[PDB]
Amino acid sequence: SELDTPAAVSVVDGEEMRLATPRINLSESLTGVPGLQVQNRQNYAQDLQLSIRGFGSRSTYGIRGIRLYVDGIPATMPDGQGQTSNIDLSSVQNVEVLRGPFSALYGNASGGVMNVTTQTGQQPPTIEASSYYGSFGSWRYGLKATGATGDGTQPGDVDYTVSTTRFTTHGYRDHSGAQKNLANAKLGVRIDEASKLSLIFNSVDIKADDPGGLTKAEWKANPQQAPRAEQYDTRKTIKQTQAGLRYERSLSSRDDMSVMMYAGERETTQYQSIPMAPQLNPSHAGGVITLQRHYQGIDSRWTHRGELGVPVTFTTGLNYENMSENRKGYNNFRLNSGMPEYGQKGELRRDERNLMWNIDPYLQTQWQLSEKLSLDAGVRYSSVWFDSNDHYVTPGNGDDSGDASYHKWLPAGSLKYAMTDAWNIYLAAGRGFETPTINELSYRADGQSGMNLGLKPSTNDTIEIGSKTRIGDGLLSLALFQTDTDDEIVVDSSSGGRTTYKNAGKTRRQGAELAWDQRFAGDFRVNASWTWLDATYRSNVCNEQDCNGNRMPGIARNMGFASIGYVPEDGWYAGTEARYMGDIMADDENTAKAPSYTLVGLFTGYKYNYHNLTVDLFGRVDNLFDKEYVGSVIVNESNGRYYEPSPGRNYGVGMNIAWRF
Ligand SMILES: O=C(O)c1cc(C(=O)O)c2c(n1)C(=O)C(=O)c1cc(C(=O)O)[nH]c1-2
Numbered sequence: 001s002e003l004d005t006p007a008a009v010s011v012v013d014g015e016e017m018r019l020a021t022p023r024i025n026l027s028e029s030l031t032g033v034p035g036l037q038v039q040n041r042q043n044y045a046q047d048l049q050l051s052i053r054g055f056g057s058r059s060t061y062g063i064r065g066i067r068l069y070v071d072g073i074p075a076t077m078p079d080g081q082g083q084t085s086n087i088d089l090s091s092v093q094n095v096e097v098l099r100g101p102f103s104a105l106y107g108n109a110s111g112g113v114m115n116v117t118t119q120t121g122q123q124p125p126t127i128e129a130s131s132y133y134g135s136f137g138s139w140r141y142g143l144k145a146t147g148a149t150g151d152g153t154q155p156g157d158v159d160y161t162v163s164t165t166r167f168t169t170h171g172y173r174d175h176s177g178a179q180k181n182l183a184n185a186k187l188g189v190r191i192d193e194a195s196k197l198s199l200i201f202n203s204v205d206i207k208a209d210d211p212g213g214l215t216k217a218e219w220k221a222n223p224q225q226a227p228r229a230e231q232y233d234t235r236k237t238i239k240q241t242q243a244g245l246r247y248e249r250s251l252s253s254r255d256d257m258s259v260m261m262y263a264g265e266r267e268t269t270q271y272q273s274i275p276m277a278p279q280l281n282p283s284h285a286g287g288v289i290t291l292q293r294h295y296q297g298i299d300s301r302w303t304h305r306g307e308l309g310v311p312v313t314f315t316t317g318l319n320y321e322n323m324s325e326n327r328k329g330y331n332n333f334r335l336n337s338g339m340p341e342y343g344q345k346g347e348l349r350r351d352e353r354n355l356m357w358n359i360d361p362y363l364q365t366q367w368q369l370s371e372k373l374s375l376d377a378g379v380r381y382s383s384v385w386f387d388s389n390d391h392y393v394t395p396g397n398g399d400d401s402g403d404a405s406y407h408k409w410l411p412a413g414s415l416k417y418a419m420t421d422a423w424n425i426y427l428a429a430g431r432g433f434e435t436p437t438i439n440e441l442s443y444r445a446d447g448q449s450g451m452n453l454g455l456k457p458s459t460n461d462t463i464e465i466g467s468k469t470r471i472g473d474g475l476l477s478l479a480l481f482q483t484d485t486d487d488e489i490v491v492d493s494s495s496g497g498r499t500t501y502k503n504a505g506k507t508r509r510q511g512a513e514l515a516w517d518q519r520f521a522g523d524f525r526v527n528a529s530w531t532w533l534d535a536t537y538r539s540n541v542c543n544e545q546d547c548n549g550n551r552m553p554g555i556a557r558n559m560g561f562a563s564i565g566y567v568p569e570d571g572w573y574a575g576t577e578a579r580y581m582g583d584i585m586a587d588d589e590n591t592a593k594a595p596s597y598t599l600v601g602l603f604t605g606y607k608y609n610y611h612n613l614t615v616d617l618f619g620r621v622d623n624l625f626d627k628e629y630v631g632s633v634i635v636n637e638s639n640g641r642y643y644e645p646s647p648g649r650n651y652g653v654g655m656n657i658a659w660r661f
């Protein structure tokens with residue numbers, strides 16, 4: 001339970017996630033999680049940037065500093081690079097956001113862990129056709145067949161959740177149209193009374209134009225413009241298909257075992273806005289990336305519920321996650337006469353086989369020291385080996401083959417005292433560890449060929465106190481944390497969508513996370529939350545001035561959410577949500593700043609139940625007051641193209657037609 005979790009945890013229920021929502025972006029529904037900053041870039045190539053307590057704000061694409069599991073399959077790779085685009089919002093049961101590295105039961109992460117579980121098929125079988133049309137020619141439809149052959153408690157009882165969605169959009173920005181085909185199957189079969197097998201299949205094909213960032217003047221003059229995106233035809237194709245086998249068994253009344261194996265393949269092509277000039281350097285990797293990532297893994301854990309002086313539940317396991325990378329880079333241009341025609345795959349400029357695999361023994365323990373006092377104490381020993389074998393050796397571009405090994409002990413602990421049956425205080429300490437991604441190692445600020453292997457991994461020590469109190473039909477959670485990070489990986493510079501990274505010697509985050517979910521008499525929901533986050537450099541990361549003490553860019557000091565929704569089981573329902581985002585620094589120097597903004601969204605729908613049929617029609621207006629703001633920044637953009645403008649007042653209408661057999 002959230003209240004019983006001795007750490008900052010938020011659980012966003014899938015149905016609330018789908019309540020009058022487009023079901024396109026996680027930002028639609030995770031906005032109410034304190035300490036979780038979800039930057040919508042209006043860009044399905046780089047996609048949503050998720051940060052937990054400031055960790056991940058450096059991510060120029062996908063997510064970093066957050067370990068994301070989608071139905072047990074890591075969306076975060078052994079190099080720490082993650083993607084949220086494969087999450088099927090239409091089929092999510094719930095999203096668990098764990099803030100802080102306070103559990104050894106998840107891989108290393110500086111910020112936290114996000115677990116997305118797909119709905120388990122239940123009775124009655126249901127086929128749900130969902131559709132949604134929103135501003136900018138946004139159109140997401142989908143079919144979800146979710147059912148089961150029994151209660152799931154008998155051998156051979158099968159549950160299934162098959163869900164396919166097609167999303168298309170012209171995009172708010174110029175050159176930001178995107179198409180995402182998503183398929184997501186969660187099958188389960190009870191082998192016998194003791195065991196349960198679960199198949200996960202996930203597939204996502206994306207073709208998204210990349211609008212890029214705008215300078216302040218560009219954003220002010222025309223927020224929709226994407227001039228570099230037009231010139232370079234910056235765009236991204238993704239094709240990721242993963243499968244997962246989760247075998248759970250009960251070996252005894254006190255013992256359980258769980259083996260989660262997975263294997264997926266992600267094919268990426270990304271045309272970037274790097275001009276020809278830098279690519280004329282033989283050491284340059286070009287302006288187009290083609291990536292073929294084959295990831296597999298097996299996490300085998302044993303949970304024993306015994307007593308050593310006091311009751312103690314320990315989950316000890318071994319996690320293996322391997323990823324191979326066939327990574328190629330081409331010129332993003334071909335020369336017509338003497339002029340580069342961009343948006344084209346040119347001459348090969350990079351060709352390497354990278355291999356990043358981590359092996360982590362881990363042991364989590366939960367001692368009931370007293371009736372009210374409990375102690376989590378876990379340690380994960382993460383050993384990560386990276387090996388780049390460079391196949392691109394030309395004059396001025398030598399053998400860039402290298403390797404690295406990071407071996408980190410990650411202890412976490414938590415003392416939780418039950419003030420009352422409804423009020424728990426907790427004090428959690430934890431060590432987080434973040435290796436640089438392969439892409440973060442790929443590029444040197446000095447422009448020479450070879451990986452930036454001087455990029456050290458970051459290690460963060462997080463202390464946190466917290467208090468969760470049930471205030472009726474709801475939870476009030478307060479968390480106060482300090483995270484001191486050594487060698488924090490930060491964006492050094494970004495140009496044309498390509499980012500070099502460096503290590504900030506010392507950073508400090510001090511934050512408070514208040515959350516309040518409450519259901520009132522009469523189908524009323526109130527979800528409030530406030531995040532305060534002082535994320536500062538404790539060392540100078542700037543090459544030209546003292547930025548020591550400056551706010552870390554990409555991180556809002558304050559975020560706020562307040563949604564009130566009248567959502568009865570059927571009939572007319574409605575809701576409104578105010579989302580405050582504090583201003584965000586776009587550079588280490590704290591000279592470029594995305595202004596703070598308040599976004600008021602409204603929605604109203606009608607659910608009609610006619611025996612086996614449910615028709616949920618709804619209309620929503622996001623950014624009700626038409627606030628001009630920037631939904632995401634590109635930190636340390638070398639040309640000051642920090643700003644990813646957000647739409648303005650926009651609308652959507654959705655229909656969810658469910659038939660229960
Ligand atoms: O979705 C992906 O798998 C993926 C991979 C990569 C990569 O590893 O090169 C990039 C991106 N996306 C991306 O969106 C992006 O803007 C980007 C820039 C670069 C680079 O090498 O400069 N890689 C990538």
Ligand SMILES: [Ca+2]
Nearest residue numbers: 392397398400
């Ligand atoms: Ca080389």
